From a paper:
The AAA-ATPase Drg1 is a key factor in eukaryotic ribosome biogenesis that initiates cytoplasmic maturation of the large ribosomal subunit. Drg1 releases the shuttling maturation factor Rlp24 from pre-60S particles shortly after nuclear export, a strict requirement for downstream maturation. The initial event of cytosolic maturation is the release of the shuttling protein ribosomal-like protein 24 (Rlp24) by the essential hexameric type-II AAA-ATPase diazaborine resistance gene 1 (Drg1). The interaction with the unstructured Rlp24 C-terminal domain stimulates ATP hydrolysis in both AAA domains of Drg1, which drives the release reaction.
We assembled pre-60S particles, purified using tandem affinity purification (TAP)-tagged Bud20 as bait from a leptomycin B (LmB)-sensitive S. cerevisiae strain, with separately purified Drg1 in vitro and collected single-particle cryo-EM data. To capture Drg1 in the substrate-bound state, we used the slowly hydrolyzable ATP-analog ATPγS to prevent full extraction of Rlp24. In the Drg1–pre-60S complex map, the pre-ribosome is well-defined, but we see only blurry density for the major part of Drg1. This indicates that the Drg1 hexamer is actively engaged and undergoes its conformational cycle. However, the primary interface between the AAA-ATPase and the particle is well-resolved. It is formed by the maturation factor Arx1 and the eukaryote-specific 25S rRNA expansion segment ES27, which are recognized by the same Drg1 N domain. The same N domain that binds to Arx1 also interacts with the tip of ES27, which forms a single-stranded RNA loop exposing four nucleotide bases. The interactions with the pre-ribosome position Drg1 so that the Rlp24 C domain can be inserted into the central pore of the AAA-ATPase. Indeed, we found a continuous density of Rlp24 entering the central channel of Drg1. The Rlp24 C domain protruding from the pre-ribosome is contacted by the tips of four Drg1 N domains at the entry of the central pore.
Residue numbers in the entry:
A (entry chain o): 6 to 59
B (entry chain q): 2 to 106
C (entry chain v): 153 to 229, 239 to 406
D (entry chain T): 2 to 160
Amino acid sequence: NHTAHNQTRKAHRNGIKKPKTYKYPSLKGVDPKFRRNHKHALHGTAKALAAAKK
Amino acid sequence: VNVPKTRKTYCKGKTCRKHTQHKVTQYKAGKASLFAQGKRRYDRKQSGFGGQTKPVFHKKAKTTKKVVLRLECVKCKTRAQLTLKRCKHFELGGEKKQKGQALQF
Amino acid sequence: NTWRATVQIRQKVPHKRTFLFLEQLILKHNAHVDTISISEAKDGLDFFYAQKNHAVKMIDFLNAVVPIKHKKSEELITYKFSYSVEIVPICKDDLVVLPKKLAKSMGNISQFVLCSKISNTVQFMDPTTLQTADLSPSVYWRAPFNALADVTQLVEFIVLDVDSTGISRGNRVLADITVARTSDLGVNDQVYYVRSHLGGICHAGDSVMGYFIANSNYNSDLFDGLNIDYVPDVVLVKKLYQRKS
Amino acid sequence: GKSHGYRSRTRYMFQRDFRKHGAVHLSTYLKVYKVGDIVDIKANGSIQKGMPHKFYQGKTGVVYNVTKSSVGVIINKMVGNRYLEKRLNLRVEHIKHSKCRQEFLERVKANAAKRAEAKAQGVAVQLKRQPAQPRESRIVSTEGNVPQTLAPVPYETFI
RNA sequence: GGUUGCGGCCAUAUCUACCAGAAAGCACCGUUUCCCGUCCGAUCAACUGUAGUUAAGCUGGUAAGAGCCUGACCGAGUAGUGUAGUGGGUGACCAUACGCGAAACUCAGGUGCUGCAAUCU
RNA sequence: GAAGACAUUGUCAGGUGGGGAGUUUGGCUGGGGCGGCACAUCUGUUAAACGAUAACGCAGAUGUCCUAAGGGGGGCUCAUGGAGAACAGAAAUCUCCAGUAGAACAAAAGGGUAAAAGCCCCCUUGAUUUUGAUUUUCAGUGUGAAUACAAACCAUGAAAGUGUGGCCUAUCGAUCCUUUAGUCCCUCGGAAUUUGAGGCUAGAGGUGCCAGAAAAGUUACCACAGGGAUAACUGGCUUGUG
RNA sequence: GUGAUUUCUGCCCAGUGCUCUGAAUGUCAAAGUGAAGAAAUUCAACCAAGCGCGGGUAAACGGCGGGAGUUAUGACU
RNA sequence: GUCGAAUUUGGGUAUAGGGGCGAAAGACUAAUCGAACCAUCUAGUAGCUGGUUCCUGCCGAAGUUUCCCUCAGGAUAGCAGAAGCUCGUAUCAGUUUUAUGAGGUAAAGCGAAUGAUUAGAGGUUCCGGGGUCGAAAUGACCUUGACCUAUUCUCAAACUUUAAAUAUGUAAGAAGUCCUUGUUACUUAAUUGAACGUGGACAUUUGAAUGAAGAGCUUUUAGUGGGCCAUUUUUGGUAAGCAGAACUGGCGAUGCGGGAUGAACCGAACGUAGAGUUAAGGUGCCGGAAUACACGCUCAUCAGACACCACAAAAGGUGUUAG
RNA sequence: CACGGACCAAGGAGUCUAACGUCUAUGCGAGUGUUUGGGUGUAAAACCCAUACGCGUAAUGAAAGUGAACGUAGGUUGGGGCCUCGCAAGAGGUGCACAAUCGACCGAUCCUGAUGUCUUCGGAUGGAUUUGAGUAAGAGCAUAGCUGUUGGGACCCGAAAG
């Protein structure tokens, strides 16, 4: 009727993988002010490097 | 029961956006609504033949009534609403929810 | 596997009253001369009997003394007989509303009609107008519905003025009474000059218990079929008559 | 039907340890959490707001966002046949800092310093730690004492 | 080292009885116009270090007192328990081998450490 | 001859109308039905230390009640026991001493709460508005509930902060259609104005068989395409001394 | 509807049925009349039979208890 | 059984299907009648029984989740192939270890906390659901609890200082550390913090073990959705091959050697042949193999002889042997 | 002791279309498709051809409408390959598609409003943890084939009924 039999077998038949832990997680789920600061900071760094190199 | 009718809480006055004049009402009896599409079509479907055809909740499992609680503003009136407790039974009147309902002790 | 007769009585009332009334009735009648056992359940109690004649006699007496619908069934184990009994879900003082068909069938009485006599034929009294109506248990079984009111919305009141009208049957009926909420007696300016049937049993400055209609948590469907213009706001039930000496 | 409450089957776990009732000490609040920090989960019955699901006792997560008096933790969950990323909001008082990272950093600094010293002195050195190996040949000399005799004890008169 | 203020660790820091703490310091102390609250200056509010204070609290020692906390070649490889057998017994079960590993009682020791600033013939 | 602007005649409308026409009679289930809701839920145990985990098992409770029993802050400490004190009663009235919770915290139960989350006070409406993500029963869908952030406003407090409904675990609802409310929002399409209607995030009216048909009996006069029948082996039960 | 052939063939109009040489102002459709709107329309009143009240009906469906009351009381309320 | 009548029958005539007909049986209506036959719609409908035709090679299931007026039925997820795609040793692991967590389950907790039970003894508004009712409220009601009145004991799944192994999580690095300083509308009294940065220093001993028969990714659709048995721990039922639960293994799909034979037991998993060695099991004969070696026990007038499994209690026996 | 099987011969059951999903092959390519139709002919073949029209080259709302670049059509991390250095080891330069992420732009919803105005219409600019099947030097069309799905009688045979 109700049983969790063979669930482990089904799970391990093909193997279990990690969520791939992609680096640079999306700014989703953090402070919007933090996101705005991040965008402004990266824009400023890009401007600074572009001015520096030529 | 009782609900507040006029209050100084958040509204949309386009001039204040503060705790100021507020209004709310109760459900109003269903109009004849001859031009309304619903009963407009229901009348012809019923009058065709077979008598009653559209499914009807004959049994008394449902007995609920309606209330219309709204974020009304006397400045102007258009499509809007206010959310309150689930309306198993609600009405209008009260004037800031008094109805002699204060818990004296 | 030696019962051979099961009698089961059920009702869907949170506060059973007719159950205890019939229990007191049968105890005073000493009808349990052959009751082999009694089983207790939260929704009611059941009886077991070994003699089919005794079981059918008991069910017939119960049917005669209280309105109930009965049904029989057989269980093969060898053979046993089981009985299912249903009683009217209306209590003594529960306000009840009826559809237009039953209303016109029972003398065109108002939907706002109370009850005052739980017996073989279920009685109905209109507080608005002194009039007695009666309904058949078979009619109720053919037309099942939920009761309009319950005993969970009772309100106490105090009567200040009583004025007669001149129409009564057996209890000085149809008297105007100035009823006020007991809760707000300290500070209030609202009262109800309502005509009720508790004329000869209520006096000035007495504590009564009744229903409430104005802003009570009332959520019926067929109630919408009755115009609000003819819906009384306050109706009484009984009084406390607290003893002093 | 088996009811599935939010806090069902947790009567023993949703309790503070013995002789430590009352309000919590203030040390749990002063500690600082930042991105990359490794944290563990343990609830408490004094604070009822922002506490995680019963599935999350003794579970390790990573800090990825911090709010006023609240932090965010990323955990890995085994459902079906895949590992899913779960994000939880945890209050400060139900988070225990992990000393694993602390001692890891301590030993990282220690081995960095020893590598610098080895490079300074000019010869190579071994870095990787190794589990202890079995014993080495030794000589057991008994001059101040002598071996004695041991034998099994009979069960007679004692049974 | 003595305090005082502000704390971290949360009984090694608690309860019962004594003992001691020289101008360095803790609290009483008396009073009510002003701000304040109740039935009242009992707490709180404010007012100044005189005529008196260490009988308080607090700070410490001791109790062949209670309790608590650290270890045990104390209680034991004990109870327990994972891996195995075509091991035994008709069973209830019991030993075996490769492992891991308890706890009440008893004994040993103690009745706080530490952070910043200021004051003390 | 009798009768007459009456009947009858055609249409519409109300009532009566198993005489007849079509249908229906839930699900789980130690046969069915009855009884019950194990059909949506909640606490513990069942249930064997992540978690998940059966039974028509048991102890059991829900379809509510609250403008305060919510928000803020302030002061006070409860049951009980002892000592007492004209009328005082075993307990009513007032004080002191002990008292880590033996009371109380709406409801059932279990967690948590002692200069408070309790008792008493003064003030307020954050049970606000506009749109997301996450978490729980999960398919990573929704329904149900919670999480703390961001954008404005307010309450309380001296201030730090606290307040997005009930200290926490349950208290409840899609499509179609109907009723009144924001920028007086859009269209009614040959071109205009006004009634009217239909146009939109969110919000009532419900579906308890609770991811939601509109519903009463009998067949032994039966048919129908199928499945099950039936006493010879309990884990060795079985015969003589409650 | 019983079923020839003798003696008797008791009582009861609560309810479901059936019927009425009674009053109406309750329920009230269509059409028509009134008000307001410029109108589409909403409401008001009157509104037939029946439904309702009352009367009759039981060789129509049907029913024919217990108690106080005095231990049995065809005394008996 | 009646046979002179309500008798039988001829010929003609009437009544044709939801109709006729019926001295009434649900009888008859062309051998079909509780709705005739005929042909059309029609190849009606089926979640239901019954069949479904050449070979070989390769891979290899599930009887489980959620929902549905759903329990013989379907979609979602899971397995499998195929088509492959991106890289090709970079990245990981059903494992152990180092260190770090949480749990309250075994057992003896009772003079470190709470405590029944079945057995039924009273109490003066120190009190309660109510009864039928009630011209009242100075008004009658029957029964548990109102009240333990004066008292004993054990542990338990709803309780106690701790507290095991099996089982579960994270970490064990260059996507790093360190140094200087670049950015902002975040925050900070303060270039102080937060994040991300350029340049510079640290490559094989780059941060435990071992392993890797290449690693990762996408679309896809058949079947699947009634299990059983064994080991341990058990739940209800008095006990059961009864009803039901957790891990692993097996049958389902799986033959082979052995228990003479049993789907499940022990080994062992299989292309086609040769040689050798063995697993479990056996070595008097059937039956291949020592009527081997050695130690001691047993006389049964129903003996006795291989585990799951086809048998067993206590107790008695100058039977016997050893203590 | 469940079902069918006396034997033998012959017949026999996943079929075709309308609509498409994935993959593959082919031609063309920001275009693509001759065959409804006309001319021509050895005559149901094949040969040649115009205007239209389907599909796509833009999404959006309820629509009235708007309409896709602040920059070598962007930044951050790897990436086969290519080039330079050096015989080797290796480093540096560039880095498509591809993978995550931060942007930017266009639409819907909610805010804020400048020269003007026919005085209340016009809606530039700048914002909003919102929302979209979008753009960011386009890829689809046409045919055929395997498989698969829906209605067709729909793998074959079968009723109690109307």
